[PDB]
Each structure stands twice: as C-alpha cells, then as structure tokens.
Amino acid sequence: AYGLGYRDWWTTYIGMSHYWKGLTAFQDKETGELITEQTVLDYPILFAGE
Amino acid sequence: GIGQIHFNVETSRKVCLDLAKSVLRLVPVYPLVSPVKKQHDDYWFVGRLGLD
Numbered sequence: 134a135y136g137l138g139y140r141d142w143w144t145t146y147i148g149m150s151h152y153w154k155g156l157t158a159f160q161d162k163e164t165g166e167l168i169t170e171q172t173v174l175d176y177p178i179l180f181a182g183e
Numbered sequence: 184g185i186g187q188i189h190f191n192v193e194t195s196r197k198v199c200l201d202l203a204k205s206v207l208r209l210v211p212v213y214p215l216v217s218p219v220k221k222q223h224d225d226y227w228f229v230g231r232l233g234l235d
Binding site: 153154155156157158159160161162163167168170172174176178 | 206215217218219221225226227228229230231232233234
C-alpha cells in the first residue's frame with residue numbers, strides 16, 4: 134500500500150467474526166447444563182514378572 | 184533340550200480366567216463415571232462467548 138502511493142491515513146473496520154473470544158459446548162435439552170471439557174476413561178492393568 | 188518349564192495354552196487360559204475372577208471380586212462394579220450420560224441426539228451444540 135505504501136509502494137503504490139497511499140499516504141497519511143488508514144481506517145480499518147475490525148471484523149465481526151474474529152476479534153472476540155469464544156467457547157463451544159453441549160447444552161442438554163431438558164436442563165440448561167453446559168459441558169465444555171473432555172476426559173478419557175480407561176482401565177490399564179500392568180502385567181509384570183517372568 | 185530343556186523341557187517342561189512353561190505353561191500350555193489351555194492352562195494359560197485357565198489362569199487368566201482365575202485372575203479375571205479375582206480382579207472382579209475386588210472390584211464388582213465399574214468405578215469410572217462420564218460427564219456425558221446421554222446419546223448425541225439429546226444434546227444441543229451451542230456456542231457462547233467467554234464464560235461470564
């Protein structure tokens with residue numbers, strides 16, 4: 134933009150879509166409960182010996 | 184050469200059954216619990232801004 138000769142002023146319209154923070158979650162239909170975190174359920178068992 | 188020092192396959196299966204029965208005896212019920220307790224149809228995918 135400087136190379137082509139535009140000088141001395143700039144006005145930018147910040148977008149609607151990107152400038153904010155946000156979250157995503159599951160909302161249960163029966164009750165307004167929000168689930169935002171995840172977990173791994175697993176049951177390792179160690180076999181050691183001869 | 185050396186002989187009769189390791190189990191057969193069938194005895195290995197029997198010992199594994201015994202171990203499974205013992206471990207079940209210690210822990211009769213499934214301990215772990217999951218935050219998501221319903222099928223995918225029940226939940227509603229929504230997006231929010233930052234909490235509060």
